[PDB]
Amino acid sequence: VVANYENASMAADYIKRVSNVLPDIGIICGSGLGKLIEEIEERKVIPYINIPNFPKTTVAGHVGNLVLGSVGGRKIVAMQGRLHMYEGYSNQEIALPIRVMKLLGVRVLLITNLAGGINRKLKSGDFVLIKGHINFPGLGLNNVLVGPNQDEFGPRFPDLSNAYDRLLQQLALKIAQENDFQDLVHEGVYAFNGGPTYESPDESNMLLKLGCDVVGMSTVPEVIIACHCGIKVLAVSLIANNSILDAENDVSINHEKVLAVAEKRADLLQMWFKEIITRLP
Amino acid sequence: VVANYENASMAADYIKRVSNVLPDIGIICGSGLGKLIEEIEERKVIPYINIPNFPKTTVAGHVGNLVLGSVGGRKIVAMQGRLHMYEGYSNQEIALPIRVMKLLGVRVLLITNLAGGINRKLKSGDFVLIKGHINFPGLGLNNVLVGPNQDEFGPRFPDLSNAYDRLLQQLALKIAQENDFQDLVHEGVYAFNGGPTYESPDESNMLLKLGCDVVGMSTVPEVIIACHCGIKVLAVSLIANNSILDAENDVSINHEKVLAVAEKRADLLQMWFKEIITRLP
Amino acid sequence: VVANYENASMAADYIKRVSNVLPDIGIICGSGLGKLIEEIEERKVIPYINIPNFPKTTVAGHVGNLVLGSVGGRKIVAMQGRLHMYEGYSNQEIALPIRVMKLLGVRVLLITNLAGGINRKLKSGDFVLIKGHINFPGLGLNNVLVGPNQDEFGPRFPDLSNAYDRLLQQLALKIAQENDFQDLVHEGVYAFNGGPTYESPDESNMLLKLGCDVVGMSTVPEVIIACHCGIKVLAVSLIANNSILDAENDVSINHEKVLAVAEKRADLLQMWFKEIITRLP
Ligand SMILES: CC(=O)c1ccc(N)cc1O
Numbered sequence: 076v077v078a079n080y081e082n083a084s085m086a087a088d089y090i091k092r093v094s095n096v097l098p099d100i101g102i103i104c105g106s107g108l109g110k111l112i113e114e115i116e117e118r119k120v121i122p123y124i125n126i127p128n129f130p131k132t133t134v135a136g137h138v139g140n141l142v143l144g145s146v147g148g149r150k151i152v153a154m155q156g157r158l159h160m161y162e163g164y165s166n167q168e169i170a171l172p173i174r175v176m177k178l179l180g181v182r183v184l185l186i187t188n189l190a191g192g193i194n195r196k197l198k199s200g201d202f203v204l205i206k207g208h209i210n211f212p213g214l215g216l217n218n219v220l221v222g223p224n225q226d227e228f229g230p231r232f233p234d235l236s237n238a239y240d241r242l243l244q245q246l247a248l249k250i251a252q253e254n255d256f257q258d259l260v261h262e263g264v265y266a267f268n269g270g271p272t273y274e275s276p277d278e279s280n281m282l283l284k285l286g287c288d289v290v291g292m293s294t295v296p297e298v299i300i301a302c303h304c305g306i307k308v309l310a311v312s313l314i315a316n317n318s319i320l321d322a323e324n325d326v327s328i329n330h331e332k333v334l335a336v337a338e339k340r341a342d343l344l345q346m347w348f349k350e351i352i353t354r355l356p
Numbered sequence: 357v358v359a360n361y362e363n364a365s366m367a368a369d370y371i372k373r374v375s376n377v378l379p380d381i382g383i384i385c386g387s388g389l390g391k392l393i394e395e396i397e398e399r400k401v402i403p404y405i406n407i408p409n410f411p412k413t414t415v416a417g418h419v420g421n422l423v424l425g426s427v428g429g430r431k432i433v434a435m436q437g438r439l440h441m442y443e444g445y446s447n448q449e450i451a452l453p454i455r456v457m458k459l460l461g462v463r464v465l466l467i468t469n470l471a472g473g474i475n476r477k478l479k480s481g482d483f484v485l486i487k488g489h490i491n492f493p494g495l496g497l498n499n500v501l502v503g504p505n506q507d508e509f510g511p512r513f514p515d516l517s518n519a520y521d522r523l524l525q526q527l528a529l530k531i532a533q534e535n536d537f538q539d540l541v542h543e544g545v546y547a548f549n550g551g552p553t554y555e556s557p558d559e560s561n562m563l564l565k566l567g568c569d570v571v572g573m574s575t576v577p578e579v580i581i582a583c584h585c586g587i588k589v590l591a592v593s594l595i596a597n598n599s600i601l602d603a604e605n606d607v608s609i610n611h612e613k614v615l616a617v618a619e620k621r622a623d624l625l626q627m628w629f630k631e632i633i634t635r636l637p
Numbered sequence: 638v639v640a641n642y643e644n645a646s647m648a649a650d651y652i653k654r655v656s657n658v659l660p661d662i663g664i665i666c667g668s669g670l671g672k673l674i675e676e677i678e679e680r681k682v683i684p685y686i687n688i689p690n691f692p693k694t695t696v697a698g699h700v701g702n703l704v705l706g707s708v709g710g711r712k713i714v715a716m717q718g719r720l721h722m723y724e725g726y727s728n729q730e731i732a733l734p735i736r737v738m739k740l741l742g743v744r745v746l747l748i749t750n751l752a753g754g755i756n757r758k759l760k761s762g763d764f765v766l767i768k769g770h771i772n773f774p775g776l777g778l779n780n781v782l783v784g785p786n787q788d789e790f791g792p793r794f795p796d797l798s799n800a801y802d803r804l805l806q807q808l809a810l811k812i813a814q815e816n817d818f819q820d821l822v823h824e825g826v827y828a829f830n831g832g833p834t835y836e837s838p839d840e841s842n843m844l845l846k847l848g849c850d851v852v853g854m855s856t857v858p859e860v861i862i863a864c865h866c867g868i869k870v871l872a873v874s875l876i877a878n879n880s881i882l883d884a885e886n887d888v889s890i891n892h893e894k895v896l897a898v899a900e901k902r903a904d905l906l907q908m909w910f911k912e913i914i915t916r917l918p
């Protein structure tokens with residue numbers, strides 16, 4: 076199934092009938108960082124499998140819902156269970172849920188992930204406002220837009236120089252200052268590693284030479300589809316570990332350690348993003 | 357359809373019956389740089405869709421013809437509308453038209469493109485004679501030769517160290533000197549970005565560290581297929597913008613700006629390549 | 638055919654019936670470096686085509702056998718004819734023979750290849766003990782583990798920091814010292830170029846900046862599948878040429894030159910690996 080105009084419209088039709096909500100904000104939350112979704116007010120939970128033309132996710136398993144409702148007086152739609160390209164999803168499967176968000180009325184997309192720190196100023200538990208990216212799959216002919224262009228959504232050759240909105244980064248920092256946790260908040264460039272193996276010690280050393288600040292396995296595909304169709308983006312990484320230090324000390328990273336950092340910071344991240352949503356222009 | 361000996365021979369059979377021309381020069385022109393094709397003498401225009409085993413190009417649309425005839429007393433074949441890998445064409449679809457050129461008698465292939473400048477000496481409107489390349493898709497398991505080797509055309513493991521003929525670069529520079537536009541003519545290394553998103557500001561900064569002089573989304577696939585089967589190559593980039601300056605000044609690039617630079621330099625490029633064809637040993 | 642538990646078990650069932658050998662060591666030998674396989678004692682040769690669920694290899698052709706028997710008192714299984722991803726094999730086709738090795742009882746995998754030297758200390762004929770890697774296909778969304786995870790074999794997100802066993806590297810060096818050829822033995826980081834074109838002169842210059850010591854077109858896919866399912870690895874590169882010197886002197890590399898270096902060092906490599914097998918804890 077192609078992520079074209081007609082197919083995205085059929086999905087949006089279904090969601091409009093079932094939910095009644097006209098959202099103008101979208102959210103995609105990282106692993107263990109979804110508690111906010113469970114506090115959406117007057118909410119409607121829609122399993123992906125029930126939505127016409129949504130990608131099939133039963134081989135990977137685990138939760139996969141679209142959730143609609145209100146936060147801080149604002150109307151939102153959330154993906155509960157994001158799709159990752161290391162599972163083998165095609166470009167068309169990744170793009171269709173974002174293009175459905177567009178047809179529902181979304182103008183701002185908020186994204187979180189966990190990632191490895193490369194910059195030596197970054198420690199476990201820090202937050203990074205993403206200001207740019209290095210897309211290794213894109214350079215290497217696996218860009219999420221490889222394929223025919225869907226002209227109704229955007230141009231054949233997008234410019235990504237303003238993909239990460241500057242004013243949204245400033246608002247996120249202002250709220251951190253108001254609550255006295257700005258000592259945790261950095262900015263930086265996100266490198267996309269297709270995955271699912273963590274960056275090796277020698278890959279980490281290479282990434283430091285190349286000017287990467289953080290590295291992870293998500294986010295860049297969704298950002299590019301959102302930028303293509305004119306949706307503004309704020310993206311924030313929660314640092315699980317510093318991979319350069321770990322290489323010097325022969326320390327390993329694993330998913331259990333990642334989820335423990337998520338649980339340690341989840342409630343503060345929930346509070347932060349609730350206020351961002353409330354304050355959005 | 358595989359780009360093998362039998363399939364390429366069937367296409368060449370058709371072209372020989374229809375055209376009568378035995379070319380020994382091939383040309384592939386970049387976007388907005390095709391005016392020379394319209395001045396080919398005693399010419400024959402063959403739509404791709406009419407040629408047995410040629411790749412289907414109707415999803416992308418736009419012009420797609422093979423054109424045969426004479427320039428400067430020399431017999432040539434031109435691709436009018438090149439195939440780009442960001443459209444989703446397979447390795448086999450890209451390679452078959454070049455291998456048909458080989459079976460028709462082509463010994464020299466001339467290529468132009470538009471590209472972004474990375475080297476700080478490059479400005480909008482400059483020309484770069486390509487002397488080498490950095491193939492990010494190839495390093496990342498998307499080389500145009502991934503697949504079974506077609507032994508009749510060339511070896512399993514090609515060496516690309518002489519892919520860009522030195523004497524053809526010297527002839528192109530000599531002609532620029534004769535017409536007093538050598539101040540526009542540089543040499544450099546071409547980085548292949550699969551695309552279709554332009555290099556981001558942070559990707560551009562990385563490319564400068566890596567020794568790239570220019571970056572674009574074409575040319576390297578055709579060069580590798582030509583080198584594999586023993587065809588000599590001259591490739592020239594027309595610089596649309598300097599992406600490093602643009603990153604420092606928050607300036608964007610778009611296809612309208614690219615085509616305006618093409619129109620500004622098209623007639624000089626036409627004059628240049630006509631004389632190169634005329635002078636080829 | 639997926640490289641899952643049930644399919645690998647069906648292949649292992651067949652091999653157990655035919656061979657009688659319960660191996661705990663696996664070997665994969667590089668081009669021209671397979672003489673040891675022909676001296677396996679009380680051996681059984683099994684063509685891939687006869688084994689249920691093994692990948693089809695007839696398009697590429699050439700030898701493809703599984704060989705089981707005894708070396709130095711130890712029970713081994715060898716792949717005679719390795720699978721290379723530049724042939725177009727899928728992730729599932731590469732992984733299934735390694736996962737069959739696991740089900741047969743393999744705990745240690747020994748690997749050789751030929752490769753190009755990047756570090757200026759490396760000459761034709763030197764050996765490099767691999768201590769880490771830089772996986773350009775993995776960064777670029779062509780990792781051998783892209784797809785659903787096969788949970789019975791290993792975790793969704795593997796850590797590769799101990800993929801190359803330190804004690805096996807120490808044993809290999811000790812044996813070289815015992816036989817007075819330690820002057821040939823280096824250690825280093827292996828870059829994976831998907832291939833099948835050799836690194837270009839300008840790609841070689843880039844690899845030196847990035848901290849790569851050697852570059853080749855194999856090994857990293859098998860290492861990652863072995864590490865995923867808990868098999869220890871020793872991997873050794875035989876240097877065919879120094880690609881940085883060759884770029885400075887406009888010297889080419891080709892497969893004939895590669896095979897001549899293999900023949901020059903084959904007997905010493907056979908002696909070395911026989912003793913390693915004999916001495917394995
Ligand atoms: C969640 C995720 O993708 C991730 C987390 C930690 C890390 N060092 C690298 C990663 O890619």
Ligand SMILES: CC(=O)c1ccc(N)cc1O
Pocket residue numbers: 387469470471472473549554555571572573574596597599609614
């Ligand atoms: C024509 C083309 O591919 C191209 C043009 C300008 C640029 N900065 C990058 C590009 O890739």
Ligand SMILES: CC(=O)c1ccc(N)cc1O
Pocket residue numbers: 668750751752753754830835836852853854855877878880890895
């Ligand atoms: C056997 C092989 O893959 C190989 C050999 C020599 C070389 N300079 C590069 C290579 O990739």
